[PDB]
Design a protein around this ligand. Sequence first.
Ligand SMILES: [Mg+2]
Ligand SMILES: [Mg+2]
Ligand SMILES: [Mg+2]
Ligand SMILES: [Zn+2]
Length: 977
Amino acid sequence: HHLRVGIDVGTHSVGLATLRVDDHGTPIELLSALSHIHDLSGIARRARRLLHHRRTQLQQLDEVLRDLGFPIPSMAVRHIARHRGWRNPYSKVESLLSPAEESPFMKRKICARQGVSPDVCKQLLRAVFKADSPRGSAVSRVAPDPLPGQGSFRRAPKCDPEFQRFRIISIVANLRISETKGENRPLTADERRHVVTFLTEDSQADLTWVDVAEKLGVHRRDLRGTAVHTRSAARPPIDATDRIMRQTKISSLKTWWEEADSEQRGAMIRYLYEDPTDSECAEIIAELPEEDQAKLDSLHLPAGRAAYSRESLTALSDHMLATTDDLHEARKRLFGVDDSWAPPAEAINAPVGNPSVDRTLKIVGRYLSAVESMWGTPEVIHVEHVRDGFTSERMADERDKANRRRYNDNQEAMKKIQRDYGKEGYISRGDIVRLDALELQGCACLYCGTTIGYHTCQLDHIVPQAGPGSNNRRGNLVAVCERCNRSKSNTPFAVWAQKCGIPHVGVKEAIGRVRGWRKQTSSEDLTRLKKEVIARLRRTQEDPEIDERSMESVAWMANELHHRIAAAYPETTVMVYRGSITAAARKAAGIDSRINLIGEKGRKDRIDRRHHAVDASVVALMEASVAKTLAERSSLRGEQRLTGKEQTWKQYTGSTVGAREHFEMWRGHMLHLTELFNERLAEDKVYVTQNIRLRLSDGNAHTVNPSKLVSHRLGDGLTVQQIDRACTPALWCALTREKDFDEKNGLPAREDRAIRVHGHEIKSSDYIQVFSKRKKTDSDRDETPFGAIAVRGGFVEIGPSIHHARIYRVEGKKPVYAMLRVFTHDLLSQRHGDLFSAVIPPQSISMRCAEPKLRKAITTGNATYLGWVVVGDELEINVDSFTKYAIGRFLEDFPNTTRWRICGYDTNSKLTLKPIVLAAEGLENPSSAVNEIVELKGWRVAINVLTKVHPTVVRRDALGRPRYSSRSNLPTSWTIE
Ligand SMILES: [Mg+2]
Ligand SMILES: [Mg+2]
Ligand SMILES: [Mg+2]
Ligand SMILES: [Zn+2]
């Protein structure tokens, strides 16, 4: 039984698919296919938690002082002030550097000080000397180091520079050198230091193992162990934290890191990640707001929790660098564990403190569990990662905008070439790069210095690439005279220079020319370019051949995801590819326009959300030989764009009979897959799912200034509408219990009225307070109630803070459907109970804001509670009757749109609905109605008219299948009837 799982990670979605193939890889059954749709800062929240806890600790200190015969606000108040101020918020000691909570002393004239032996109460008291200050991480819970002897140290976050260094060293410690066969030796300590120093020189370099081989002075073929597991590293490792810090859009942070103290780099990373307890930062941080702002939450440090503490990480690191041990041997020697000892891996869904990542990880974890339970262990789990991408909606938006920018800069470059050279027709990337290089190089051949121009110069790849294609990055391309290009042939520059004997051709001369480069109009980009070019001008070995791992993602989160999945499914082959693989595959197998998705196709961006399920299905079917061939076709294409010639890359399907046969077979499989997928679409079993929130939203909020309450003299009488806006439920009870309260006319004017609210007597001559949104100079006599709560200084609205809606049928000859929106506030007292059956009493703000007819029906026992919905819930709706207004016209353009998602409660009797299958971004010049329904307001429909067509509230399990019953008490589907 061959099961292949595919996962397509997007910015806002995850496509998921399970495929059964036979012994020769032909897809025979598409078992599952679906699209799961998703939907201050950490630094200052940690700061605030810290502030409150410390504060209460200072209060405890005052408690100690008062009861110690000291006054909280002449020697006595002096001692008070000294101990409070000059110590308690100062944390001076902090002597021998300890996070050990409690802390031993280890150690006129007569008036001060002592004591003598006592008042160590005071010393122990200074915020209890932070014993124990923290309730939250990194104390609870950051799990302890599991190595024997290390159990008092907390495990380090993977973003810690010490972890990054450990990882690099560990990988280097797996490398072998072959000097004769078969006589592998590990790298010596000196070699290890040399390679580690090299890999940490520039975290922004894009190196291959060939670069490492050259640094070691060995042929690439003689360097081994690059593919050994600690997944193995296809490319040499870098410090991912340092790279992120040097590439961040937060200017002053980058600047700081640049000149930072190294120990201070570590301390800073710890601060930004989880420890709100340094002085230097945030004394470093506070500067330059807006950068301090939501920008700081945009900083995406490498995720994950290391298996070991910093202490262990550095001990293991130093040992591996100074010897020839690998990690396994290192751990045995340093800590004495046996050969079977292994640290556990984080669970797939273990939180990384990043909302998008975390939602993705929960989805993947539960899908893989459901797949295994239902069908058995998969042979492969293939993932496609998104791009850049997968950090936030924010960073995705920004990168998209900057991509439209770069697109425009390229279009301008094309225009300028057409203008300046009169080039009609296709303007290749070769044309653009050649002109750019000519200008950069001041019209001189990089290799021999001779004058060249647009007619005479040619573009060269400095370093050739073994096998089909070349490395086509700008840093491997230079403008060159015809003579040097012809002489150099297929040789790396440095090798050719050593033997060509042409005047002014050499490595040093060429480097010199490169150092001479200046911007023709981004200096960072240029500096990077120059470093890349200089490095390539030194190279004496070819770039390595394209292989099955050329398409593998090298993003941190991709490696971490690979690690968690492989550890959770040890018998399964796991791969995480970059987010271009499925588009490449779909083009090569020619299957866009074969899938029967909604959309003109017309691509552009696919409007049908089921496309993520297509991409997951395709990635499930990917295979090593095919990945290699696709990477090659792409490289060949890059090459032929540089020569601007007749493109033949589409005809390349491999260099051996075996590769070409695999590729053709795979194209056959892709054809089968489109048949199975179309058939599944026709059964309507390609699902679109989304989670619903069942728990109460907690805290956060605030940040809100109160509106003013309005005062009414009780004795002047009150209308029903004024009473319904009473500033507290208790006041509402007291007003409506009056013997002369009238359901229509409210309370009449009376001079002898006396009511009781919380023990307090309120008389006719007193004033009560109501919520109002009107000026105090206008009448609120007919103002209807709205969701509000009293707070300090007045009230705030609780607009969309609604937890669920309960649907009722008001019984009668003409039955009427209505809903009660239950505000989150009204469930706080019954938090840990059944939220959907908690009592919502007449005096509650929820009831008082419901339709009067529903209120009256509930109070008289004429309302039948059908069931509950929440925002995010799916509705299946017969839409035949809806041919009027905006919804009718929308339906003209997208007929039989029957699956809808509840987006909100437009009013106390209307739901806002948007279609589930359709993506706003895929719209191309929409009619105003379509834009209104999909993109803007959504379909706003009265509960009574909606319910008359008997829609079904659809609830789905982890495989996206409708759930009609549950022995686990999970929410189930139900028809509103
Ligand atoms: Mg050449
Ligand atoms: Mg080649
Ligand atoms: Mg994708
Ligand atoms: Zn030349």
